[PDB]
Amino acid sequence: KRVQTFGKKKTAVAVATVTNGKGLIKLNGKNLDLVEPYILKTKVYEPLWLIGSGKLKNLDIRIRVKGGGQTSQIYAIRQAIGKGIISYYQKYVDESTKKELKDVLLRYDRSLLVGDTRRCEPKKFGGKGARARYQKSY
Amino acid sequence: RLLEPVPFVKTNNCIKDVDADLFIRSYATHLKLHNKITYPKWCTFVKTGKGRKLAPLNEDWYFIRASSILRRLYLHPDIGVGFLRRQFSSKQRRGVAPNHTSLASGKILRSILQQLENLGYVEQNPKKKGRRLTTKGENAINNFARYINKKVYN
Amino acid sequence: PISKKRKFINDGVFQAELNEFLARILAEDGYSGVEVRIRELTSLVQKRFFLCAMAQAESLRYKLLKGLAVRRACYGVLRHIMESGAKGCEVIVSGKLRAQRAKSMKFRDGYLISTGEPSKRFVNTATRSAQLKQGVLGIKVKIMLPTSILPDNISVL
Amino acid sequence: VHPKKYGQGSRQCRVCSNKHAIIRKYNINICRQCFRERADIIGFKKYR
Amino acid sequence: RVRTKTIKRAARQIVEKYYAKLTLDFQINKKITEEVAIIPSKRMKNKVAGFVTH
Amino acid sequence: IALTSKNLRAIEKVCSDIMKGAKEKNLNVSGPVRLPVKTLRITTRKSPCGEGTNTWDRFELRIYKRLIDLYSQCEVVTQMTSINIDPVVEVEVIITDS
Amino acid sequence: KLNHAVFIVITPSAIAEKYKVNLSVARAVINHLADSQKLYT
Amino acid sequence: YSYIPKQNKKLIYEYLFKEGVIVVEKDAKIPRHPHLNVPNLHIMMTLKSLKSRNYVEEKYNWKHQYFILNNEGIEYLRE
RNA sequence: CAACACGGGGAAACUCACUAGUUUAAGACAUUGGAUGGUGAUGCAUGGCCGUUUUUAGUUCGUGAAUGAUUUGUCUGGUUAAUUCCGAUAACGAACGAGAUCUUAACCUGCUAAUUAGCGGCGAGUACACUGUACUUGCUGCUUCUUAGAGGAACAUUGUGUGUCUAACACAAGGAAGUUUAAGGCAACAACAGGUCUGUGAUGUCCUUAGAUGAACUAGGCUGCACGCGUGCUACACUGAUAUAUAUAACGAGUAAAAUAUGCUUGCAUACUUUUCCUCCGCCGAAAGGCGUAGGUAAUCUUUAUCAAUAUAUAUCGUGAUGGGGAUAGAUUAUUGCAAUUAUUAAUCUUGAACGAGGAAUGCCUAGUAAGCAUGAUUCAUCAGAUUGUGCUAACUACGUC
């Protein structure tokens, strides 16, 4: 049927909806390629290349990305696709197959599975930066 | 360049299925060729917005502006002039003073919107507050989007 | 008509004025709450609007003001505070103190914590101005109350 | 007299009548030094 | 990093009154400290349980 | 009823008491709706005067809003609420037919 | 100082190096030859 | 000049007797009291004098006087 | 240092104390005497609050012991973020500080919950395919994601090394998280004649009080300039400028004066409307900006499944004080205000200075930081190059030593 999940890097959130379909993937109303930077494009195609083209051919994927900037969105998308594929195989397909798939993703990178939790250190008075200070002089 | 190998299934049914720029340039070129919307003459002497602080310096830009606006209208179905002014805003170097974004010139925007509206592309309503896209335009934009997608792809 | 943000600030400011107004009035008694004697005060505020640290400190300044010896008064108050079951107490007196050079004098007893949120949680604190002949004396009282629990203590029966 | 209902001389602290350093955010109308004396009972607690 | 007097002292007191129940698992020890001790913070209870386990 | 306060624990106590009160009488409540917390933050210079280092403290007034829509006779629910509140909880009317 | 002019690897720098041309003129030569930076033929 | 009408003085005295108390408010360029449509400067002048004669006591808090009559004052004001 | 974008001090007026002057009574009381007020004098008379000492790790007692001030306890050593622990040990036992507590931010409860949040369910079209996909109006199980309550979760857990093998550390693994998970907040004792009476109706004394240092009004001035020193801003170009296009952010913040009618005469007086805050939106304006309207007292409207700029892509220059650089000046029409000249601010055309990577010197900084890029808020009638928040773009170099 359908499973819904997310990815979260910095202040970005990317919701992934993994349903029964044919291999159509959209990002909001718009096709998956239409995200712009060619270098970071490859990062979002990266899980498709680790898993081949057959697995997506049974499933349609819809993605909703809100918040955060450019780099943050790309990682959140990458993370959400990961979390989506693996979660769908745990509810619907098969736990052993899912474990094999999870092993392939883990073997490549843990960043796909679970987002980096780095976030801002607050500004503190006495300087423009988070820790940086005004120039002192004698 | 424009074509690349793809690892998923494209749909090609809408403007949301094709890259902004190719659609925009072709539609702008088509619009000027057809001659549906005027230049108009006074528009060559003014700037797009104050962040430019220079002439627009690119000749065919008015058709491009119309083309982008039309696309924005399919993207976001209810908007007014302020949305456009904010959209086309960019940064203004204030000389010694810091930068700020500064809004796009509203007459040229207002005129484009009005010409499209006259030609049945876009529509002022109370049911949805501002300008929306309207039916002759919706059909044309969708169809032109298909025509371009096929023509570019193979 | 007004917003919730506006409502909350006005409520707070009204409290602050009333608190200072209680301070101007309340030299004739201790502390016995407020009602949300009473006829005139109610009339004024309605006309306008349409162990206890404060008590100990108020008592202490009245004793000091009456010109009783400073040590005797401090000791009397401190001993009374401890008598009332205080886990600790500190009374500070600042200003001229029978000389032409200003000074302070500390009178501490008991645990009397000072660091972190247990300090805010268990210590009640009070400031009082005693005007005497050559200017003003500052009373600052700190009382550490009966305790919930004090977080450091760990023990087993 | 010739007051103005705008600008610096138009207004003053609700508690102390200083013309300077007044918080008009949220319409408090109190000077910041006075505000520090009242800051707990109004509800503007410190945390982080 | 280490453990302060309050922690160590408590750690010694537990065992003193409950050695027989206490055992070589941290989670079981933590369960025992939660039952026995009067400590008000999670982090502190865990810290005591860890040191009693040690 | 809609409950607005600057005391979390007081609002929570009110929430539980009206919830129990209603559930005796089988009344239709739509389960506690916690609104986004608004904080009134004031950023204050320390020292009444300039001297010494520039040192700031950041004050926060955190206001709690919570919401329950209810289908019943008004009078009993307001009377149950109004007597059970502490005055730090500000109670406002909301009512439905379903 | 410039000493490059109008008349007589497809990078602009290579063309400028080989024929001693300004980079807009180097670009003009590239465009003529063929019939910011991006994939090559 | 700066006269205060005989009726106005009587009304201020009467108000003070009727209530028992008056919240004058310190500022003098505010034109009326909410419950007396009387020049605040005049009310302030008479209260200052009355306190000086010792028939009315003021507590005072920021911007507000809080005047309560002495018992001798309460009797005196009637005539 | 611990003064010098500090006195929230971004002063057109007022603010204001000052300069040139002009007024006023707002001189209580029992004419007369008599005060009251004072951004007047005194922080080396003082209260309060705050800075430093110092956010380091220090400080103190009971009893004991060693003519006295005193010293021991509170230490050769190991260890640590830490008079933190261990260990030794004429001291044993304590207490405050510190840790701890508290606020955020970090992860999980398929429990707790659905409004002004989402998600589906389902009608209905518009569009394309093709035995669904995109797009809008109407009704209405779910709670994964939006929100926020309660509660869980790490203790160095396991393994391996080093360590009196003691306190403990090191590495690897596990794990949402391993530098007490990251960040704050809180601030002992004893000080400093540190700072503040220009925050206070906190306040002593000393001064002053109708030819006032009170209150108040008009100008002028705090911004002037042979010249010396701070903190910032903007640059010196091609990993760039210029011009189009595309993508995409978080914290927020928002309500006794205006206008129409009447009586007197456009002036004055009175009534009525509904007026001051955010502006969507529709018209008009090159632009500034205007006019007309609409919703918002706010998870509801401004506005947010999108409000920024650095992004990135495609064009145009083509290294030349150059189309770099925007100081400087000249001419404008707007906008705020009683008042804009010493150009308030705004746009528009023209005008085109130094500056070729900075001597001697000297500052900040260790991971979502630094740097770069913005932006919200504070003051605000009007005024960010300031401060304070907040994000996005995400480096270098260790990971230690005296």
- Residues 30-49 of chain A with CB under 7 A from strand I are 35-38
Rounded distance between C-alpha atoms, residue C72 and residue F31, angstroms:
62
What residue ranges in chain B does DSSP mark as E strands? 90-94, 97-102, 122-124, 131-133
Q: Which two tokens stand for residue C69?
A: 């010896």
Token pair 């934009």: residue: B141
CB A72 within 8 A of CB A102: no
Rounded distance between C-alpha atoms, residue C132 and residue C98, angstroms:
10
CB A34 within 8 A of CB A63: no
Distance of CA B111 to the CA centre of its chain: 13
Rounded distance between C-alpha atoms, residue A124 and residue A131, angstroms:
7
Kindly state the greatest CA–CA separation across chain G: 32
- CB-based contacts of F86, cutoff 8 Å, min separation 6: F7, F10, F13, F14
Rounded distance between C-alpha atoms, residue B51 and residue B91, angstroms:
5
CA atoms within 13 Å, Cβ hemisphere of B40: 9
Q: Looking at chain F, which residue has its C-alpha nearest residue D33?
A: F48
Please state, in angstroms and as integers, the Cα–Cα distance from residue F85 to each residue in B8, C37, E24, F18, F81, following that order.
60, 28, 50, 10, 6
CB A73 within 8 A of CB A16: no
Q: Which nucleotides of I are covered by protein (CB under 7 A)?
A: 1-4, 6-9, 13-16, 25-26, 28-30, 39, 45-52, 79-82, 84-86, 95-107, 110, 112-116, 119-120, 126-129, 132-137, 144-150, 152-158, 167-169, 176-177, 179-180, 182-191, 193-196, 198-204, 216-218, 230-235, 240, 242-250, 252-257, 279-289, 297-299, 303, 305-320, 326-328, 337-339, 347-349, 352, 362-371, 373-375, 377-382, 384-394
Please state, in angstroms and as integers, the Cα–Cα distance from residue B24 to each residue in B16, B63, B72, B79, C31, following that order.
12, 9, 11, 19, 78
CB A81 within 8 A of CB A88: no
Q: Is the CB of F55 under 7 A from strand I?
A: yes
Nearest alpha-carbon partner for C23 in H66, B128, G11: H66
C27 burial level (CB within 10 Å; 0-12, 13-18, 19+):
exposed
Rounded distance between C-alpha atoms, residue B109 and residue A92, angstroms:
52
- CB-based contacts of C29, cutoff 8 Å, min separation 6: none
What residue ranges in chain C does DSSP mark as E strands? 88-95, 103-110, 123-132, 135-144
Nearest alpha-carbon partner for B132 in B111, B110, B115, B117: B117
CB C99 within 8 A of CB C134: no
Rounded distance between C-alpha atoms, residue B104 and residue B29, angstroms:
23
Q: Is the dihedral of CA H13, H14, H19, H20 positive or negative?
A: positive
Q: Which two tokens stand for residue F64?
A: 């709690």
C19 touches chain D (CB under 8 A): yes
Residue F5: CB atoms within 10 A of its CB come to 22
- Residues 48-107 of chain B with CB under 7 A from strand I are 48-58, 61, 64-65, 68, 71-72, 75-83, 86-103, 105-107
Pairing of β A59-66 and β A25-27 = parallel
Nearest alpha-carbon partner for A59 in A28, A13, A119, A17: A17
Residue B89: CB atoms within 10 A of its CB come to 17
CB proximity under 8 Å: A 118-137 to F: 125-126
Rounded distance between C-alpha atoms, residue H63 and residue H26, angstroms:
5
Report CB contact under 8 Å: H62, C17: yes
C149 burial level (CB within 10 Å; 0-12, 13-18, 19+):
exposed
- CB-based contacts of C75, cutoff 8 Å, min separation 6: C107
- Residues 98-137 of chain A with CB under 7 A from strand I are 114-137
Pairing of β C103-110 and β C135-144 = unpaired
Report CB contact under 8 Å: C25, H23: no
Distance of CA B124 to the CA centre of its chain: 17
Q: Is the dihedral of CA C24, C29, C34, C35 positive or negative?
A: negative
Smallest CA–CA separation between A52 and chain B, in Å? Answer: 9
Q: Mark A85-106 as b/e (b = at least 16 C-beta within 10 Å).
A: bbbbbbeeeeeeebeebbeebe
- CB-based contacts of B41, cutoff 8 Å, min separation 6: none
Interface test with D, best of F61, F64, F88 (most D CBs within 10 A): F61
| C17 phi/psi in degrees, rounded to 5 | -60, -45
Residue A4: CB atoms within 10 A of its CB come to 15
Beta bridge partners of H33: H36
- CB-based contacts of A114, cutoff 8 Å, min separation 6: A79
CB F4 within 8 A of CB F65: yes
Rounded distance between C-alpha atoms, residue D44 and residue C13, angstroms:
11
Q: Is the CB of F98 under 7 A from strand I?
A: no
Rounded distance between C-alpha atoms, residue H56 and residue H24, angstroms:
13
The technique is: cryo-EM
- Residue type for B15, please? I
Q: Is the CB of C94 under 7 A from strand I?
A: yes
A108 burial level (CB within 10 Å; 0-12, 13-18, 19+):
middle
Rounded distance between C-alpha atoms, residue B143 and residue B18, angstroms:
12
Beta bridge partners of F33: F67
Report CB contact under 8 Å: D42, C19: no
**Cβ-based interface (< 8 Å): residues of C facing F:** 4-5, 7-9, 36
Q: Mark G7-24 as b/e (b = at least 16 C-beta within 10 Å).
A: eeeeebeebbeeeebeee
E strand or H helix at D14: none
Rounded distance between C-alpha atoms, residue E35 and residue H36, angstroms:
69
CB B39 within 8 A of CB B28: no
CB B123 within 8 A of CB B132: yes
Q: Mark B112-142 as b/e (b = at least 16 C-beta within 10 Å).
A: bbebbeeeebbbeeeeeebbbbbeebbeebe
Resolution attained, angstroms: 6.7
Q: Is the CB of D45 under 7 A from strand I?
A: no
CB B70 within 8 A of CB B24: no
Residue closest to I177, CA→C1'? A117
Chain E contacts of C122, Cβ < 8 Å? none
Nearest alpha-carbon partner for A115 in A61, A71, A49, A55: A71
Which nucleotide is the nearest neighbour of E39, by CA and C1'?
I100
Total residue length of chain G: 41
Nearest alpha-carbon partner for A47 in A90, A3, A79: A79
List the Cα angle E43/E46/E49 in 5-degree steps.
150
- CB-based contacts of D40, cutoff 8 Å, min separation 6: none
D42 → closest Cβ in C5, C6, C12: C12
- Residue type for C1, please? P
Residue C99: CB atoms within 10 A of its CB come to 8
Q: Is F82 helix (H, G, I), strand (E, B) or coil?
A: helix
Rounded distance between C-alpha atoms, residue H12 and residue F84, angstroms:
44
List the Cα angle F17/F18/F22 in 5-degree steps.
120
Q: Is B135 helix (H, G, I), strand (E, B) or coil?
A: helix
Rounded distance between C-alpha atoms, residue C90 and residue B40, angstroms:
84
CB D46 within 8 A of CB F57: yes
Chain H contacts of D11, Cβ < 8 Å? none
CB B132 within 8 A of CB B77: yes
Q: Looking at chain A, which residue has its C-alpha nearest residue B15?
A: A30
What is the arrangement of strands in the sheet containing C135-144, beginning at the earlier edge strand?
C103-110, C88-95, C135-144, C123-132
Nearest alpha-carbon partner for F56 in F65, F43, F67, F69: F43
- Residue type for A98, please? K
Q: Is E5 helix (H, G, I), strand (E, B) or coil?
A: helix
Rounded distance between C-alpha atoms, residue H56 and residue H41, angstroms:
17
Rounded distance between C-alpha atoms, residue H57 and residue H67, angstroms:
6
- CB-based contacts of A87, cutoff 8 Å, min separation 6: A3, A5, A18
Rounded distance between C-alpha atoms, residue A68 and residue B75, angstroms:
20
Rounded distance between C-alpha atoms, residue H57 and residue H52, angstroms:
9
Rounded distance between C-alpha atoms, residue C12 and residue C28, angstroms:
26
* Residue H75 per-residue DSSP state: H
* Residue A97 per-residue DSSP state: H
CB A78 within 8 A of CB A110: no
CB H76 within 8 A of CB H58: no
DSSP tally for chain D: helices H, then strands E: 1, 3
Rounded distance between C-alpha atoms, residue A62 and residue A42, angstroms:
18
CB H62 within 8 A of CB C17: yes
- CB-based contacts of B29, cutoff 8 Å, min separation 6: B60, B63
